[PDB]
Structure 1
Amino acid sequence: GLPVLNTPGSNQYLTADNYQSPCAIPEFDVTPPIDIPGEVRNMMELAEIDTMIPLNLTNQRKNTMDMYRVELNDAAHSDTPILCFSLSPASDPRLAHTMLGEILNYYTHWAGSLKFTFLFCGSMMATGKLLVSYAPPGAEAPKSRKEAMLGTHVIWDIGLQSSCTMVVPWISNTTYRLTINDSFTEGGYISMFYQTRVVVPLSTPRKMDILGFVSACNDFSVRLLRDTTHISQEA
């Protein structure tokens, strides 16, 4: 017969192989498909959908609805940050549980910019100005508005727009970032401060909540599919 050679790797099972296999049900009548609404062809298409961020993970607000809201008041202007977190979507607890974080948890490497949106849920009479800043990697995390205003930032003018979106530029020293906690691929920090204050008239609520959302940009991509760290099974 035709000479053959049993090259290395034969008689082995690989979970990511692609070989033709015999059909267990020959000549089966396959049901024709139908146009089911909501066709998805790439997982990244889901990463571009806004997901509410569980920003407040305090011991009292954890694992309830309150963790999805950030509180604001009409107190005098202060440089103390309103909100702070790190650009580690696959490692930060506040972002790892979002759709972006969940998808990233299935992959080892990722790249691309992100959109962070904030929605104001106060009254119409309420108005104010807020600052949202992104500190690039390699610098001490901002501790006051004075350090926050040294980098990319956006102004949320509550009174003209009820929502504000900020785009995080792809400032990195590597082509791709890792989905684990490591100082090699730090993504920087994102902080939110007051600009002047929240102003409300008489007979108006003085405690108003804002909602945060995170989504992927058009350039977002992932690679090196891997198992997630938020899954377990008995035995």
Structure 2
Amino acid sequence: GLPVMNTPGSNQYLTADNFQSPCALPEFDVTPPIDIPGEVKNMMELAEIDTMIPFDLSATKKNTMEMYRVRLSDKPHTDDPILCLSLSPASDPRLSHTMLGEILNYYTHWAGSLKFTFLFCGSMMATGKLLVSYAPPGADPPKKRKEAMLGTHVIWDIGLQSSCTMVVPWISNTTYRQTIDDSFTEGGYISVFYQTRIVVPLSTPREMDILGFVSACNDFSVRLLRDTTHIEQKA
């Protein structure tokens, strides 16, 4: 017999290991594959698809068809925020459960550029100009158009083109961010405002809803596979 010497790790079971093993069903006539539509090769592909954001997670709206609707109105111009949101894709309650947030929670680290698209579900007769902002961490989270205007933003003009996309560029100190709330790997602030004001004629609804969607740009990636907290089996 060939002289061999066993090394540390011998006989151990590494749940993540990758070796060969005897087949329990030898010579088994395997049923061939058919060209089935919708085949996926990488989890990131799903993250690149636009998914609706549950923005209004308030006591009464949360866990109902309503949490998805961000309500606007023909009311007078105000430098106050329509909606404030933290750039924590995997940890922030409003992003954590979106297709993107969900896949992110199966991984420990995330990197790259995200893109937020807003859909104006109000009437055709209704005009308006909104200001979508992105403020990289390190300073006072914007509470007024004035401050928000000073950082990465897009002045969305409502018309034929129903929707407007704002790209949140990959701006970070570390090569990767943590899929959890962490001061050190913080992403910054995403806020929305009234550039001018939602204007509507008579015989028309002074109040309308705007839907919001999030998806990952082609420069986006995740690493360090891990078990998620979004599902459990107490018992």
In structure 1, the partner of 2:124 is 124
Correspondence for 1:223: 223
Report the secondary structure of 1:199's partner residue.
coil
Q: Structure 1 length normalisation: TM-score?
A: 0.99
Identity %: 88
Match of 2:152 in 1: 152
Corresponding letter in the other structure for 2:176: Y
Aligned pairs for 1:155-166 (under 5 A) are 155-166=155-166
In the alignment, the residues of structure 2 paired with residue 43 and residue 230 of structure 1 have an alpha-carbon distance, to the nearest angstrom, of 17
Is the counterpart of residue 61 in structure 1 residue 38 in structure 2? no
Q: Could you give the per-residue CA deviations for residues 180-209 of structure 1, whole angstroms, max 9, x where no partner exists? A: 111011101100000110000000001100
Separation (CA, whole Å) in 2 of partners of 1:185 and 1:86: 12
Q: Look up the match of 1:211.
A: 211
**1: CA distance between counterparts of 2:216 and 2:193?**
23
Aligned residues: 235
Gaps of 5+ in 2: none
Residue 230 of structure 1 deviates from its aligned partner by 1.0
State the distance in 2 between where 1:192 and 1:2 align.
Answer: 72
Q: SS in structure 2 opposite 1:147? A: helix
- Structure 1 match to 2:97: 97
TM-score (normalised: structure 2)? 0.99
Give the Å deviation of 1:159. 2.0
**Counterpart residue number, 1:8:** 8
For 2:210 and 2:150, locate their aligned partners in 1 and report how far apart those are by CA, in whole Å. 24
Q: Distance between the aligned counterparts of 2:234 and 2:114, measured in 1?
A: 36
Q: Which runs of structure 2 are paired with 1:33-52 in the superposition (5 Å)?
A: 33-52=33-52
Distance 2:192 2:141 in 1: 12
Q: How does 1:134-213 map to 2 (within 5 A)?
A: 134-213=134-213
Residue identity matched to 2:114: L
Q: Which runs of 5+ in 1 are unaligned?
A: none
- Cα distance in structure 2, aligned partners of 1:187 and 1:160: 33
Aligned-residue offset at 1:156: 1.0
Cα distance in 2 for residues equivalent to 1:161 and 1:129 = 13
Quote the offset at 1:162 in angstroms. Answer: 1.3
